[PDB]
Swiss-Prot record, chains A, B, C, D:
Reactions catalysed: dCMP + (6R)-5,10-methylene-5,6,7,8-tetrahydrofolate + H2O = 5-hydroxymethyl-dCMP + (6S)-5,6,7,8-tetrahydrofolate
Coiled coil feature spans: none
Any GO MF annotation of the entry: deoxycytidylate 5-hydroxymethyltransferase activity
Lineage: Viruses, Duplodnaviria, Heunggongvirae, Uroviricota, Caudoviricetes
Keyword Transferase: yes
Protein name as catalogued: Deoxycytidylate 5-hydroxymethyltransferase
Family note: Belongs to the thymidylate synthase family.
Gene3D superfamilies referenced in this protein's UniProt entry, alphabetically: Thymidylate synthase/dCMP hydroxymethylase domain
Pfam families found in the cross-reference section: Thymidylat_synt (PF00303)
Gene: 42
Enzyme class at the top of the EC tree: transferase
Active site: 148
Organism: Enterobacteria phage T4 (Bacteriophage T4)
Record's keyword terms, sorted: Transferase
EC number of this enzyme: 2.1.2.8
Length: 246, 246, 246, 246
């Protein structure tokens, strides 16, 4: 059986409770955050707070597909968040396409596919993003990029494929929305590739279980939580917002 | 805030429900298991079903401390479970002492200690057990040992250090009891070392949160689940047991 | 006066000298090239090395005429070189017909025609291919197509119309042959259209001056340079070739 | 290899030959010019004919740094050449600081720096000054300013950075001296910024290659060419000059 987990709605409630109680934690940049530690929930919605920007997600998907570890290869103008985190040559660590499709990271996609193709019940169907050398690699050439995704395991039960996503650190507003788009993409891909290998498999995408060490909102997005707490709306324009989180 | 997780007592209940409903899954050895996928609970007891064998746990601790990748170096008679999984030269992968203390695995314990000593609020305080090359390493020289522990992250909040344990696969009866004893040991050690570096820290051991891709019971231990379901006792002698799981 | 420039024969000689001296530069694909920087010569021959394929050039002319930015609209089977450089929807940037005849690129042909029709001596008769936004456009939707032609200026002196072609990057073997066919076409067109406006003009096509930032040969075509260096023949079948550039 | 180009001394010779032969072309103002079409030379001197006025060049540098498209913002008294070419509100197009540093022109300097910092061997390292809409923009609000510089490309070879400057039109006497001072400034800046990003790069300024569609001298400066032809002096006072170009 799949575990009886929280949903995104209940995560929203706990994040609102945390802000209500001023349970703040100081980020490495010096700014405040609210936070749930050891979060586990079914990702039954594609975002938590904020708006869906399918345009950005598609540019990031194309970058993942290229497997490039240089932020300039992100289609179009590179987001400043990617610029500030990059090395002195424009390099990073956290291209998730490189992580699962590069032979440099030991063919994570292909090996998980072969595993599950040979034994559908396997507990060893897993894609390993992070690496032991990350202790030293995260600030190579002055980058600041310690891999936030650790592992994603895939379990086929009742002809549905469930993903168990293990993250170290996930921003609620931008992080989860982008990362979920990615994990949903890869799950759909895996289902396709297994079904294409044998037409009697008839697998379907199951649940994505999201496990996060520190799931947090930054102070600049507190107004989103505050507004939802008052009104029940998961998004406002920063201009239309009124309340103490200015 | 720390998430509102299940406790061991609730995990027992769900496993008892899975057996009651005959929710069986076939293991790679061909034997049946019951199973919870994407389990997440606070490890608030040192075992789930069965009895505590402090003698064995101490021998396995001594083996971890040696950092030896050979099963003959387990003090005394090497258990058969370790023999059947070892390579042709008696080698394995899953010595957790090697994983956190060897320089070959990039000094996991020391680097996580240095991180947390420099920034107590860090989300980057983590010990990475598994590795990308595990896709190929798990059956080197004919061993069968795919690393079950992925990562353990440590978060200091309110002067308590919480451990978030991410496992791929965990046997409920033997695995959890031994693995919990290990993770408790390391958490206590980390607290001590951080406190020894500065006497004003005054950190204390917090919660151990257990995240398991597949948390399962093998058919040979079904009689334990069944007996608990009927009586509420978490252990019987296999000889004293009466019921249909013989 | 028109400047005393190199000819194609002298370009051949310098390219042979570069290969002789192993003056190699590593392409972005990881492969080797020889190269002349800041090349300037009169294009007094329709190719440098290799053979003329009038069949391909005509298919590319028809695509230019359609002004389509999708590579599938190239008549017949699309060359793989155009496929690998295209976006995820089959789109590119470098349709030169779009560049000079589209109203989206500000009517370059028509405006240059009007300029030269009004003042034959003008220094402002120019067709601008590239654009400032090319810094961001070159990898839109995952294409890899940074416009190689910058500008072509047209100067009418002594009743002859001279073209000054400014390119960023030009492949010696395929690039120059195709691109020259195009630039010769447009020059002949411009002469026709100006003569048709006034029968007393009697303009004639003059010289095409080719200016290239990086004029290069890829390693897979080194055998052409090598063979010419030994024999003086500007083409061999790859099968008939014998020498160290296999 | 860098192409074997003419030097400034040879350009002087060809201009002296053109005047000797009365190879005149009528300017748009109705005045005569001598002219070299498709000129390409290494700028190995900071001027061709005339005298260096470091005072004026510094004022024009300060104007470029402000990025202002209004000629009144040139420090001190705005030169009449800039007044007669400006629009009804004093606006122009050809502030080169605006061209390379404004976000309105798509961040030319920064993007070329990011390209070359990521791949030193790149052929895509370029600053695009002009734009397709210049066909309409050159006489906006009655200005007369059609961008004279098209593109400048930068190529790093043998740890030297070579600039390839592509101009549509360049006055030999005032234009080249001012424009060269500008391009030298930017090349030195780019070297500094690349070296500051990584101390092992150790790049040095290479050659500036000057490519001009129409390189010309106006009739009011013919006395300079004539005097040099006779004596070899690259400058005279107009009062001290004696000869038929009065
Ligand atoms: N795909 C990603 C990459 C990064 N992060 C966020 C999580 C943290 O807010 C920050 C990483 O910081 P740290 O390394 O300090 O956790 O980036 C994320 O949510 N998802
Ligand atoms: N420290 C460990 C090592 C192994 N296992 C158990 C979990 C599975 O029952 C088995 C590994 O099998 P698989 O690799 O098929 O998951 O070993 C465990 O519980 N804890
Ligand atoms: N009409 C074209 C289009 C492209 N290229 C060649 C020049 C380079 O070999 C490559 C472009 O690569 P880069 O953008 O890296 O210069 O394509 C060319 O010669 N002519
Ligand atoms: N930075 C600049 C700007 C302009 N010009 C000169 C070249 C021509 O003499 C004139 C522009 O005229 P046209 O647009 O007719 O070429 O200005 C120049 O030399 N350099």
């Amino acid at each position: 059986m799949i575990s009886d987990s929280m949903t995104v709605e209940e995560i929203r409630l706990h994040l609102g409770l945390a802000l209500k109680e001023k349970d703040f934690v100081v980020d490495k940049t010096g700014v405040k955050t609210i936070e749930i530690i050891g979060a586990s929930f079914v990702a039954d919605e594609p975002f938590i707070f904020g708006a869906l920007n399918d345009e950005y997600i598609q540019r990031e998907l194309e970058w993942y597909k290229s497997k490039s570890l240089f932020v300039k290869d992100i289609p179009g103008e590179t987001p400043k968040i990617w610029q500030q985190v990059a090395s002195s040559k424009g390099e990073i660590n956290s291209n998730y396409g490189w992580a699962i499709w590069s032979e440099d990271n030991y063919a994570q996609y292909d090996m998980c596919l072969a595993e599950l193709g040979q034994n559908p019940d396997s507990r060893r169907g897993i894609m390993i993003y992070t690496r032991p050398s990350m202790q030293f690699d995260y600030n190579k050439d002055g980058m600041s990029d310690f891999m936030c995704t650790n592992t994603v395991q895939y379990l086929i039960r009742d002809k549905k494929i469930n993903a168990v996503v293990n993250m170290r650190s996930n921003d609620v507003v931008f992080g989860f929305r982008n990362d979920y788009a990615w994990q949903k993409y890869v799950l759909d891909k895996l289902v396709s590739d297994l079904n294409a290998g044998d037409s009697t498999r008839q697998y379907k995408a199951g649940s994505i279980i999201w496990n996060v060490g520190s799931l947090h909102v930054y102070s600049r997005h507190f107004y989103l939580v505050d507004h939802w707490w008052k009104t029940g709306e998961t998004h406002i324009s920063k201009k239309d917002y009124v309340g103490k989180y200015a």
